[PDB]
Every structure is written in C-alpha cells, then in structure tokens.
Design a protein around this ligand. Structure first.
Ligand code: HEM
Ligand code: HEM
Ligand code: HEM
Ligand code: HEM
Ligand SMILES: [Fe+2]
Ligand SMILES: [Fe+2]
Ligand SMILES: [Fe+2]
Ligand SMILES: [Fe+2]
Ligand SMILES: [Fe+2]
Ligand SMILES: [Fe+2]
Ligand SMILES: [Fe+2]
Ligand SMILES: [Fe+2]
Ligand SMILES: [Fe+2]
Ligand SMILES: [Fe+2]
Ligand SMILES: [Fe+2]
Ligand SMILES: [Fe+2]
Ligand SMILES: [Fe+2]
Ligand SMILES: [Fe+2]
Ligand SMILES: [Fe+2]
Ligand SMILES: [Fe+2]
Ligand SMILES: [Fe+2]
Ligand SMILES: [Fe+2]
Ligand SMILES: [Fe+2]
Ligand SMILES: [Fe+2]
Ligand SMILES: [Fe+2]
Ligand SMILES: [Fe+2]
Ligand SMILES: [Fe+2]
Ligand SMILES: [Fe+2]
Ligand SMILES: [Fe+2]
Ligand SMILES: [Fe+2]
Ligand SMILES: [Fe+2]
Ligand SMILES: [Fe+2]
Ligand SMILES: [Fe+2]
Ligand SMILES: [Fe+2]
Ligand SMILES: [Fe+2]
Ligand SMILES: [Fe+2]
Ligand SMILES: [Fe+2]
Ligand SMILES: [Fe+2]
Ligand SMILES: [Fe+2]
Ligand SMILES: [Fe+2]
Lengths: 155, 156, 155, 156, 156, 155, 156
C-alpha cells in the first residue's frame, strides 16, 4: 500500500534512531559511572527521545504495509572522554538530519504528506538536540573543560 | 550547523515586520484606551503581545542558525488618527507581512530548511487570524455604523 | 495641553526605553543561546522592566495630548561577549539616567509634579539596574571571567 | 513642631476645594442614580468617596502642624442639570483644584515642608486621574453621541 | 408626582442640619485622635458616618419628590476646645436637630406624606440614640472625674 | 561615584540613626524594667524602625561608593523618668529632621533625586514619631502623670 | 538586690564588645551584599542579629542588677577591605570577646553571681560557634583558593 521508496526512507531513518538509542544510552551510563550525573541524566533523556522516535517510525512503516528493519545496526560513535562523546553525538545528529531532509523531499514528491509531517516533527527534535550539543561544546571553550565538568557533577 | 544566508535574510525580514507591528499595535492599543474604547484597547494589546512572541521565536531561530538578529532597523509605522483608519492601517501592515511570509516559506522549501518553514507557517496562521479579526471589524463598522460600533467597544 | 518641552523630554526618555528593550532582549537571547541561562533570564526581566516603563511613558504623553514617538530608534550597543554586553548595558543606563535627570529638572521648573514623580520612579528602577551591572562587572574582577560564567550556566 | 503659617493656609485652601468636590460629586452621583444612569452614578459616588479621604488626610496634617482645619467655609458648588454639564462642571472644578495644588506644592518646597509636599503630590496624582476620566467621557460623547453614551451607562 | 413644596423645604432643612453634624463630628473625631484619645475619636468618627448616611437618604428622597437638594448652605459648626465642650457642642447640635425633625414630621402628617414621615422618624430614632450617648458621656465625666474619663478613652 | 557632599549628608543622617537606635533601645528596656510594658514595647518598635533606616542609608552609601561611618557615635540623651525620656526622644527627633531637610536641599541641588526620595521617606517616618511623642506629652498634661503611667503598664 | 559593682563593670565591658560586633558585622554584611557575595552577606547579617540579641540580654541583666548600661562608648571597629581581611577582622574581634567573657565568668563565680555567670556562658558558647565558622571559612580559602571560595558564596 505505501510507496516502496518512502518505506525504504523510513527504514533508513529508523536505522539512525537505533544507533542513537544505543550510543546515547551508553554515553549516559559512562557519565553516570564517572560521577558526571547531570550529563548522565540529560543523555538518558536524549536516549528515551530516540526510543520514542523509533516507535513512531515502526508504527508508520507497519501501517504502510512495510517490514520494519530492527536487525541492521550501524556504527556506534563511542567517545572516550566528555569532549569526544559530545562531538560524537553531534556528528551522529548531523548525519541524522541529512537523511531526514532527503526523506522529506521524497515524501513531498509522492504526496505522502502524513509521513512528511512525522519526519518533520522528528527533525525538529533532532535540531533541538543539535542546539544542546553545540551549546555544550561552546561552553567548554568559554569556561574550560574542568569548570564545565564541575558544573555537571550534581543533578 | 550554519544556516543558509538567504534564509537568515528572510528571517531578519520577517523579524523586521514583527518589530513594526509590535510598536504600531501597542500605540494603537494605548490610543484606544486613552479614548475610553477599552475593548479595542485590550484586544490590540494582546495582538501586540502576539507579535512580541513571534519576534522572540524568530530571534532564537536566527541565533541557532548562527546569523545576527537585526533589531536596529525599524520600518515605517502606519499610525491612524481614528478607529477606522487604525484598523485599516493594521490590515495593510498584516497584508504586507503575509506576503513576506509566503516568500520566505518558498525559499525555506527550496533549501530544505523544513524547521524554519514550520516556524514561519505557525506565524503565518496567526497573522491570518489577525486579518480575520481586522476584516471582521471593518465589516461590522459597515453593518452597524461607526457610532454603534464604538459604543459596543467602550467597556471591557 | 501639557507643556511642549515636557512632552519632548518624555519622548526622549521613551526613545531611551525603546533602545534598552531591544538591546536587553537581544542580549538575553544571546546568553541563552550560549547556555548562560542565569544571565539570560535576568536580562530578559530587565527587558520586561523597560517595556513597562515605556508603557507608562506612552500613557502619560497621550494624557498630556502629545504624540508618542515609537518610530525613531537610536543605536543599539550590542556586545560580542559577556563582559562587553554588560558594559554596553551599563553605558546605555548611564546615558538614560543623565536624560532622566534633565527631564526631572524641567518638570520641576514648569510645575508638572506628576510627570516628575513618574520619572523619579523610572530613575529608581534604572539605578537598581546600574547597581546590578556594576556588581556583575566587579565580580568578574574578583573571581575571574571563567568562574563568573560557570556560576551563570544554570538558572 | 508648629507648621509654617502659609503652608497651613494652603493646606486649608486645598481642604476647602475637597469639601466642594465631596458635595458636588455626591449630588451628581445621586442625580444620575435618580435618572437611572447607574454606571455614571456609581463611578461618581466613588470619586466623592476619594475626595472624602483626601479631606481626611488634609485635616489630620493640619492638626499635626498645630493649625485649625476650616470645615466652616464652603465655596461654590457647580451643579449641572444634564449629564454633559455635570461632567463639564466636575472638570472645571478639577482644573481649579489642580492649579491650587500646584501653588501649594511650590510653597511647601520653598519652606522645606517635604512631607506636606508629598501628601499634596499624592492628591495631585489622584486629581489628574479624575481629569483623565472626565476628558475621556467628554471625548466619548462626541465620538458616539450623547444618547448612545447615556445608553452605555444605564446598567452597572 | 411632585412633592409638597413645604415638605421639600423641611427635608432640605433636615439635610442642612446633617451637613453641619457631618463636619462637626468629623473634625471632633480627628481632634481626639490628634490628642491620643482614640476611643473618643473612633466613636465620633462612626457618628459622622451615620450623619453621612442620613444625608444620603434625604438627598435621594428630595430628588424622588422632584426637589433640588441644597448642599450649598452650611450653617454654623460648634467646635469645642476641650473634651467636655466638644461633647456639649455635639449635644446642643443634636437638640436643635431633633426639634427640626419633630416639626418636619408634623407637616408630613398634615399633607399625608407618610413615606417622608417614616424616613424622618428613622432619622429621629438614630438622633435620640446619639443624645443618649452624649448625655451618658457628660454624666460619666461627673461621676468619675474628667481625668479618669479621658484615661478610659485613650485606647481603642 | 556619588556626590561627595551628598555622601557626607547621608553619613550625617546615619549618625543620627545610630544615636536613636541606642537611645530608644535603652529607654525601651528601662520602661520594661519599670513594668511600663506598653511604653517599652512601643519604644522597642521605634528602635527597630531606626535600625531599618540605618540599613537603607548604609546600602545607599555603598552603592554611591562612599564609606558608611558606623564608628562615630554622638551623644545619647538618656532620661531618668518617663517624662524626661519622652522629651529626650523628641529633642533627638527634632535635631534629626532638621538635618534631613538640609540633606534633601543638597540632593535637589546636585540632582540626586533617588537619595532625596529615600531621605523623604525617612523624614515621613520621623514626623510620625514626632506625632507620637508630642501626643504622649500632651496626654500627661491632660490626664496627669500617674494616670498616664497606669494606662501604660499592660501591653 | 544590688549587684556587685565589679560584676556590672564586667557586664558593661561585654556589652561594649557586643556593640562593636553589631556594627562591624552589619557593615561587613552590607559590603559583601554590595559586592554580590550574597551568601557571605546573609550569613554575616545573621551574626549581626545574634550580637544584637546578646546585647539585649546584657542590658536587661544590668538593669535588673540596678546598674547603668553603657551604650555610649563604642570601641574600634575592625573593618577589612576584602573578604579575607574581613573574615580575619571578625575572628580577631571574637578572640578578644571570648577573653573578656572568661574573665567576667571568673569574677561572677567569685562573688557567687551564678545567674550572671550562666548568661555569660551562653553568650560564650555562641561566640565559640562564631569562631568555628570563621576559622572554617579561612581554612576553606586555603584549601580551594580565594576565587573558588568567593565563587561558592555568590548565590544564596
Ligand atoms: C537498546 C537498548 C535500550 C535500552 C538500554 C533501553 C532502555 C530503556 C529504559 C531504561 C527505559 C525506561 C523504562 C522504565 O523504567 O520504565 C526505556 C523506555 C522506553 N523504551 Fe527503551 N531501551 C532500549 C531500546 C529501545 C528500543 C530499540 C525501543 C523502540 C524501538 C525502545 C522503546 C522504548 C519506549 C517506547 C520506552 C517508554 C518511553 C516513555 O517513557 O514513553 N527502547 N528504555
Ligand atoms: C514598544 C516596545 C515594547 C513595548 C511597549 C512592550 C510592552 C510589553 C508589555 C507591557 C508587556 C507585559 C509585561 C508584563 O506585564 O509582565 C510585554 C511582554 C513581553 N514582551 Fe514586550 N514590548 C515591547 C517590545 C518588545 C520586543 C521588541 C520584544 C521581543 C523581541 C518583546 C517581547 C516580549 C515578551 C516575550 C513578553 C512576554 C509575553 C508573554 O506573556 O509571553 N517586547 N511587553
Ligand atoms: C454631603 C456630605 C457627605 C456625604 C453625603 C457623605 C456620604 C458618605 C457615605 C454614604 C459614605 C459611605 C458610608 C458607609 O457606607 O460606611 C461615606 C464614607 C466616608 N466619608 Fe463621607 N460624606 C460626606 C462628607 C464627608 C466629609 C466632609 C468627610 C471628611 C472630612 C467624609 C469622610 C468620609 C470617610 C473618611 C468615609 C469612609 C471612606 C472609606 O474609607 O470607605 N465624608 N461618606
Ligand atoms: C547599629 C546598627 C544596627 C543596625 C543597622 C541594626 C539592624 C537591625 C535590623 C535590620 C533588624 C531586623 C529588623 C526587622 O526587620 O525585623 C534588627 C533586629 C533587631 N535588633 Fe538591631 N541593628 C542595630 C543595632 C542594634 C542594637 C544596638 C541593638 C540592641 C542593643 C539591636 C537589637 C535588635 C533586636 C533585639 C532585633 C530583633 C532580632 C530578632 O528578630 O530577634 N540592634 N536590627
Ligand atoms: Fe531521533
Ligand atoms: Fe529518495
Ligand atoms: Fe504534526
Ligand atoms: Fe537526536
Ligand atoms: Fe557529589
Ligand atoms: Fe507577527
Ligand atoms: Fe528568496
Ligand atoms: Fe512545529
Ligand atoms: Fe499580526
Ligand atoms: Fe469585539
Ligand atoms: Fe464607562
Ligand atoms: Fe527603563
Ligand atoms: Fe529642558
Ligand atoms: Fe510614585
Ligand atoms: Fe534599566
Ligand atoms: Fe548572579
Ligand atoms: Fe547544564
Ligand atoms: Fe481631591
Ligand atoms: Fe504661596
Ligand atoms: Fe509618600
Ligand atoms: Fe478629584
Ligand atoms: Fe433597567
Ligand atoms: Fe443625623
Ligand atoms: Fe411646616
Ligand atoms: Fe421605616
Ligand atoms: Fe445625630
Ligand atoms: Fe498608648
Ligand atoms: Fe530614623
Ligand atoms: Fe549641604
Ligand atoms: Fe521611592
Ligand atoms: Fe525616629
Ligand atoms: Fe501586672
Ligand atoms: Fe555576642
Ligand atoms: Fe574582675
Ligand atoms: Fe541558663
Ligand atoms: Fe559573635
């Protein structure tokens, strides 16, 4: 029933969500293990956000009579310190929004306006995540790494 | 994440229209209150607040895209001298604003800035509600006559 | 009805308020974009204060049968970092209080004691803003810039 | 602490103005209520109460300064015979009242009676609000017409 | 329905007495407060308020009967210079007032204005209660001595 | 910096506040020791009022970049019975209000309208205190001293 | 019941120390508030209030013992120009105060004034808590450094 290429786009977006879920969940637990509990808590909520995006994508693919692909897990970008982990999440988000833009073009082209609207809501949420990440990396420059970690020790 | 230079230019143009509307509607609100047309005064005040919140969202989007919000350049206020002119001045300003919103949305679509498009569409919906109010008021002036129209807008 | 020179004074104070509104609002949003949320929220409230002063001046000019001038916008002093932004706000406030003092003198001279009282209330509010700004700049000297910014990350 | 003789005279002159306004506004209030213009009657009643409170504060200040409050001499009431004259009568009284308040404030400043000045400025602020109200009503009568204006002030 | 001309004159005479009493009691009230005799001051304030309410009722009745309430003519205030004289001044005013009320009630009866009669009787009951208070206070001054009486009225 | 002569006036007003604080507090505790608890409680609250005036003066002097002078303590006028104590407080207030008027004259001359407004608020409170004191002295004459003390035994 | 003359002198000496501490701690509090170190400012304000309560109890005790409290003679305030000196100044003032309290308690014990001794012991306990706070703060400045210490006392 749904357009084969829209479903292929939705499964590509879903694949990015599945990478983001695992990467942000692991970073969260790394920050909690290091005692950087404010970073840990925020990253956990970012993980949950991705989980909810994946759920909406799976439901849409099934409604369109496609097969959701949860088998293919791309590359996790795992950092070894706070600065690399923030940059790894940012790199993942920039790749995610590029794929969202191309999927939205295709939805418009075949007149799947409901799928386009779902993807635009996901895109809004990803750009809020980019905003957060760029702000944090900018704060590290303004106050220095050690001061930055200090302000994120306690929730 | 650096935004398209021409999208930022469009957003600064919309922002410029918002800043005109903030000042024009606020002055109109206070003129009507000074005349004792408090119902008009209060409605116009809330329209001004609406423009203020639009400007806030635009300023925040421009900064996220790493552009410079322009709050320095203030175009021409259309200040009326009586109720009928003030309503028509607001309508002329809204019709220009929606023309500029349509052109900005077109450009956002071309460069795939779908989040900026969505912000502009939300602002555009609100301006069309403002046009609906203004055209409705001008029609009521014709149906009941000016003095009757003012009479019904004396009390809040 | 009201004295023509008093109305010009009131419109000049109004002109200073309109500059302050835009400058503080922009500075607030700049600080929020940088993640300095305590600075951003305080500066937003300063912006809101100027808005209420402007409202009071517009109402008084209309009662005096004058024409409020919301058309002429003087020069915004936008800083590029926290220390310049604070200094730009301080420069703007010191000019605003100079003009308030000259306006109060004239109101006294022509016996417009109600306009004088309105202007004295605004002046009290401006001096509290000056106290805040000079205190912030002194704290930057006492604890250092990076420590100062660290204390204003979270609201 | 005996007050300045000329400050007390000014304070007694202001009090004399309050006493006229009390009686004038109260009678106008009851005239409007008798005519069934209850919104005008109620607003005018509250203006009368406000003048009563001004008189109270002046009387208390005169006694503290060891003067004799004069409640015996009642100047001329300006009683109108219709709504438009009544508003104009109240406005003429308020314009005279504010002229006298301004001269009293000048004199308080000259002899350094800053507390009396501050009392008089609070009264002056309240009288200028009443002038704002009166001029607005007279403006509305021109904009909507007398019969329409009275219509909107029948019910509370 | 226009009221009897002589009844309206009687009502305006009663109104004139109320206006004297309002000002006399208000000034006496503030004099006692200024002297720190706050219980006397507070009781006298409430007497003043009662006269204000009588005046309001009279003004309303005169207007209903299509007369002109006279708030312009203010008779002689009897201001005392100490507590005993102030109480006696109030008592002298109350006795003059009840004589005028009695004469007004007789005329109302003759021309069958029974509603005006009933209003005046209510006012008279209240005036006789004030006479009861004043005579009681003057008697207490005799029984306990002046200094003890004032001591008893320092605090509210 | 604030005007040098305004600051000097403010330190003079402060010096008077510091005398009243101690004088009224001591009188309050004397009346309590004598069992005149109503006088003691009222005098205590007058002492507290002066403490609040002193606080507002200290804060304004610091804002103007002056040095608050809490070191120089002038002459306390301590009475030995109720009538002298009330008269000592009254003499102190009359001296205080004379100095307030001269300070307000100076504020007006140099356009320090906020300092003027603060001093005018202090003067209003001092004239309320003068009202209380003259009223009490008048009551001692009207009812006699022993009757006056009787009425001030209980709170 | 006349107290021992030397006990009263000791109490007036302790009182003299409290009066210095009131003024010094209040000024330091307002200096810290003026610099934006609001946590230091608030804590120092409460230390000032503590000394005010000590002074009150001493004054009451001196009067009960039929002495004359001396609020006239004010010793030397130790005012610092920065946080570390202000803290050291309060600490130097507290060490002098506790030395005088110990000597007063010795004398109270000698003449069997056990109630005055117990009052002085209560004050001494409170002064030793203040010394604990001051020494802890000075120790923290060494452990974390001055800029970090000030940083942690900016916000209440
Ligand atoms: C791969 C590792 C994952 C981990 C470690 C993980 C962990 C969690 C945790 C700890 C919670 C909170 C549960 C609770 O305490 O109530 C949660 C909630 C949730 N998860 Fe996951 N999750 C993972 C993957 C996924 C995936 C792949 C999906 C869907 C495709 C998903 C969907 C959800 C949803 C819908 C919720 C409820 C969110 C809400 O509060 O609305 N999760 N997950
Ligand atoms: C002539 C210039 C302006 C005037 C007279 C004005 C007036 C006001 C007033 C009276 C309020 C109500 C505040 C309160 O009572 O708490 C307000 C709120 C507000 N203003 Fe303005 N304003 C002006 C310009 C601006 C500008 C340029 C902006 C932003 C770009 C702005 C943004 C806001 C916002 C965000 C609020 C809060 C609205 C809400 O309730 O969500 N204003 N303004
Ligand atoms: C024709 C003369 C006057 C009339 C008809 C009048 C009438 C009234 C009335 C109806 C009230 C409300 C009473 C209540 O319901 O409790 C009132 C209140 C009051 N009046 Fe008068 N009054 C007159 C003159 C005065 C004067 C000469 C003074 C003072 C010098 C005065 C002082 C007051 C005060 C202080 C109140 C209470 C106001 C408040 O705080 O609500 N009145 N008057
Ligand atoms: C010398 C300058 C002084 C200043 C600036 C000052 C300031 C203050 C302030 C601001 C308060 C709080 C008042 C309130 O809002 O409740 C206060 C309370 C108090 N003061 Fe003072 N004070 C001073 C001297 C004194 C002295 C010399 C004494 C006693 C001899 C004293 C006794 C008290 C007492 C008993 C309280 C009430 C504390 C409580 O709540 O238990 N003060 N003071
Ligand atoms: Fe996502
Ligand atoms: Fe495609
Ligand atoms: Fe949607
Ligand atoms: Fe994301
Ligand atoms: Fe911890
Ligand atoms: Fe808008
Ligand atoms: Fe374009
Ligand atoms: Fe949206
Ligand atoms: Fe609009
Ligand atoms: Fe409407
Ligand atoms: Fe109205
Ligand atoms: Fe302002
Ligand atoms: Fe001028
Ligand atoms: Fe004011
Ligand atoms: Fe300001
Ligand atoms: Fe801060
Ligand atoms: Fe954070
Ligand atoms: Fe008035
Ligand atoms: Fe004069
Ligand atoms: Fe005031
Ligand atoms: Fe008035
Ligand atoms: Fe009706
Ligand atoms: Fe009566
Ligand atoms: Fe008769
Ligand atoms: Fe009846
Ligand atoms: Fe009576
Ligand atoms: Fe008392
Ligand atoms: Fe004081
Ligand atoms: Fe001077
Ligand atoms: Fe003020
Ligand atoms: Fe005082
Ligand atoms: Fe007792
Ligand atoms: Fe102590
Ligand atoms: Fe000893
Ligand atoms: Fe004990
Ligand atoms: Fe201590």
């Amino acid at each position: 029933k749904g357009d084969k290429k829209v479903i292929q786009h939705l499964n590509k977006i879903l694949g990015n969500e599945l990478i983001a879920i695992n990467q942000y969940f692991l970073h969260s637990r790394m920050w909690n293990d290091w005692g950087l509990k404010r970073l840990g808590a925020h990253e956990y909520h970012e993980s949950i956000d991705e989980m909810k995006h994946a759920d909406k994508l799976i439901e849409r693919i099934l409604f369109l009579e496609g097969l959701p692909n949860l088998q293919d897990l791309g590359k996790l970008l795992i950092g070894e310190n706070t600065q690399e982990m923030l940059q790894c999440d940012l790199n993942l988000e920039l790749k995610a929004t590029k794929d969202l833009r191309e999927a939205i073009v295709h939805c418009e082209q075949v007149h799947d306006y409901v799928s386009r609207d779902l993807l635009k809501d996901i895109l809004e949420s990803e750009e809020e995540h980019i905003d957060y990440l760029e702000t944090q990396l900018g704060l590290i420059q303004k106050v220095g790494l050690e001061n930055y970690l200090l302000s994120h020790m306690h929730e």
